[PDB]
Design an enzyme around this catalytic site. Structure first.
Site, PDB file in Angstrom:
ATOM      1  N   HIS A  41       0.663  -0.917   0.064  1.00 34.04           N
ATOM      2  CA  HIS A  41       0.494  -0.008   0.312  1.00 34.04           C
ATOM      3  C   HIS A  41       0.993   1.170  -0.132  1.00 34.04           C
ATOM      4  O   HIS A  41       0.135   2.498   0.098  1.00 34.04           O
ATOM      5  CB  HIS A  41      -0.953  -0.044   0.782  1.00 34.04           C
ATOM      6  CG  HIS A  41      -0.120   0.164   2.521  1.00 34.04           C
ATOM      7  ND1 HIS A  41      -0.562  -0.840   3.834  1.00 34.04           N
ATOM      8  CD2 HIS A  41       0.103   1.563   3.280  1.00 34.04           C
ATOM      9  CE1 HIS A  41       0.143  -0.472   4.151  1.00 34.04           C
ATOM     10  NE2 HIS A  41      -0.129   0.798   4.194  1.00 34.04           N
ATOM     11  N   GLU A  72       0.469  -8.356   0.443  1.00 32.32           N
ATOM     12  CA  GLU A  72       1.435  -6.960   1.314  1.00 32.32           C
ATOM     13  C   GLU A  72       2.493  -6.416   0.859  1.00 32.32           C
ATOM     14  O   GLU A  72       2.770  -5.467   1.947  1.00 32.32           O
ATOM     15  CB  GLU A  72       0.041  -6.450   2.475  1.00 32.32           C
ATOM     16  CG  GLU A  72       0.014  -5.118   2.953  1.00 32.32           C
ATOM     17  CD  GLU A  72      -0.419  -4.660   1.712  1.00 32.32           C
ATOM     18  OE1 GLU A  72      -1.426  -5.090   0.783  1.00 32.32           O
ATOM     19  OE2 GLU A  72      -0.572  -3.429   1.617  1.00 32.32           O
ATOM     20  N   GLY A 146       1.239   5.586  11.207  1.00 34.62           N
ATOM     21  CA  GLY A 146       2.730   6.428  11.273  1.00 34.62           C
ATOM     22  C   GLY A 146       3.655   4.125  11.705  1.00 34.62           C
ATOM     23  O   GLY A 146       4.985   4.849  11.090  1.00 34.62           O
ATOM     24  N   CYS A 148       3.625   1.917  10.027  1.00 32.08           N
ATOM     25  CA  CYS A 148       3.001   0.495   8.725  1.00 32.08           C
ATOM     26  C   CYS A 148       4.850   0.913   8.003  1.00 32.08           C
ATOM     27  O   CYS A 148       5.628   1.490   7.837  1.00 32.08           O
ATOM     28  CB  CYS A 148       2.706   1.171   7.237  1.00 32.08           C
ATOM     29  SG  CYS A 148       0.999   0.492   7.793  1.00 32.08           S
TER      30      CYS A 148
END
Ligand code: SYX
Length: 182
Positions: A41, A72, A146, A148
């Site tokens: 992402h 991911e 904050g 990730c």
């Protein structure tokens, strides 16, 4: 404070950079040579900022399992003038559960941040932001925006990168040794 935080710090101090995309600032784990990982992402493009330096992306691959399900994890090869310490020998070979993990973050908003998250479950399937996702690790800590890209470690092992949360639990994508063979 103790041996879990010791291993986490040793990874942070040599194997992380601050990555900036048009979707924000992320903790980015360097694994070997010029190869790093970031949550998918982050939407890595042809150019990324690495510690505030404009850097060409030589390759980016959004990983999926052999069922064509999102993992991911994006693997990024950076046009950087310096290699990372090779840490592939600290990656697990198989899916597993863990005790006593640390989540470590380093950004402009959260420098030198370490969180003892406790027990890590092999959760498996998660609908992450509406996207079916596999190989998810879960920990019972109220992780926040904050975090990730944050690195999940035990003593001896680098086991995942933080990709999300639901306000009470946090979720990491597994890192496996087989993602980084060459
Ligand atoms: C002196 N001890 C042996 C060398 N160690 C390491 O390689 C660290 C760095 C990455 C995680 O473990 C631990 C400290």
């Amino acid at each position: 404070m103790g041996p879990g935080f010791d291993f986490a710090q040793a990874i942070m101090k040599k194997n992380t950079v601050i990555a900036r995309t048009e979707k924000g600032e992320f903790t980015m784990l360097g694994v070997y040579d010029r190869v790093a990982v970031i949550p998918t992402h982050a939407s890595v493009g042809e150019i990324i900022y690495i510690n505030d330096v404009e850097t060409r992306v030589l390759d980016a691959c959004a990983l999926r399992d052999l069922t064509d399900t999102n993992l991911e994890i994006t693997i990024v090869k950076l046009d950087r003038n310096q290699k990372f310490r090779d840490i592939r020998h600290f990656l697990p070979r198989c899916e597993d559960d863990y005790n006593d993990a640390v989540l470590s973050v380093h950004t402009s908003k959260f420098p030198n941040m370490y969180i003892p998250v406790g027990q890590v479950t092999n959760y498996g399937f998660l609908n992450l932001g509406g996207t079916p996702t596999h190989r998810i690790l879960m920990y019972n800590f109220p992780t926040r925006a904050g975090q990730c890209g944050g690195v999940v470690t035990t003593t001896g092992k680098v086991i995942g990168i933080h990709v999300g949360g639901n306000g009470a639990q946090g979720f990491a994508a597994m890192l496996l040794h087989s993602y980084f063979t060459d």
